[PDB]
Amino acid sequence: HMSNFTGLKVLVMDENGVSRMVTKGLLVHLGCEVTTVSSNEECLRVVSHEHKVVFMDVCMPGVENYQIALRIHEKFTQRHQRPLLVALSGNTDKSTKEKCMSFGLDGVLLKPVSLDNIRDVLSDLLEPRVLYE
Amino acid sequence: HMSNFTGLKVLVMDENGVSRMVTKGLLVHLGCEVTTVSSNEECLRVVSHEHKVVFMDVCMPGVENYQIALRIHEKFTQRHQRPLLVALSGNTDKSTKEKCMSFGLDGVLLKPVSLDNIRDVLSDLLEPRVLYE
């Protein structure tokens, strides 16, 4: 497991201030350097290689909120690695999972979020994995 | 599942001709465009963004054969994505797994190899994955 991400450069994209604020607060308690944005256009100019992870809100109906992740893949396709994309939603049913895959999200968090679901995901995403067989 | 990788740009690095030859043959039957090399120095100059996957042999004792994967991570750290690294070994016990992780290998194949273990790995590596929670 992995309990703290002290120094983790992460970005939060959420149109809602409270949600954005809460999310930043949790990440800060875990030791993250959190940059926040509240619009897609803003997310695209701010997101840099500095950011190891981008948590984005996807609670709008359909895939309106997933487009930004595609736009984000386009951008880093400059020298540095594209950041890991994590979606923030009210569900994780097939609906959501399907969308994240086709749209490039690497992980998904169920809302409201807690240190608990945040650690697990950041741990999985950040920790070494090898597909044996 | 995923049965054919027609058009898959892959590279094979193996000092042994037969092993290198066999591996290329299997990948060609699956539809891959296989480039092969037989030395580390050679692997480093040939490996390009063209290559979506690099299968490398790691049967030397210790981690002598894993170094090339580190050297490969260094290189793409230019614009294009680093290729997925797959190790070819005679075992998959903890010994191997530990090494692949610390050295950046994304997957590992047990030798001798077969279309079977090749498909599974390429499928997992290549197919969309999302860490929900």
Swiss-Prot record, chains A, B:
Localization terms from the record: Endoplasmic reticulum membrane
Task: Enumerate the spans annotated as Response regulatory domain.
Answer: 9-126
If researchers knock out this gene, what phenotype do they report?
No visible phenotype in ethylene response; due to redundancy with ERS1. Ers1 and etr1 double mutants display a constitutive ethylene-response phenotype.
Residue(s) of cross-link: Glycyl lysine isopeptide (Lys-Gly) (interchain with G-Cter in ubiquitin): 111
The post-translation modification note in this UniProt entry reads:
Autophosphorylated.
Which residues are recorded as modified (4-aspartylphosphate)?
Answer: 57
Domain notes for this protein: The GAF domain is sufficient to mediate heteromerization.
User: Which family does the UniProt entry place this protein in?
Assistant: Belongs to the ethylene receptor family.
Q: What's the stated role of this polypeptide?
A: Ethylene receptor related to bacterial two-component regulators. Acts as a redundant negative regulator of ethylene signaling. In the presence of ethylene, the auto-kinase activity of ETR1 is inhibited and the non-phosphorylated kinase domain binds tightly to the corresponding domain of EIN2.
Question: What quaternary arrangement does the UniProt entry report?
Answer: Homodimer; disulfide-linked. Heteromer with ERS1, ERS2, ETR2 and EIN4. Interacts with AHP1, AHP2 and AHP3. Interacts with RTE1. Interacts with EIN2.
Protein name per Swiss-Prot or TrEMBL: Ethylene receptor 1
Give the organism, scientific name: Arabidopsis thaliana (Mouse-ear cress)
Which span of the entire protein is present here? 603 to 736 of 738
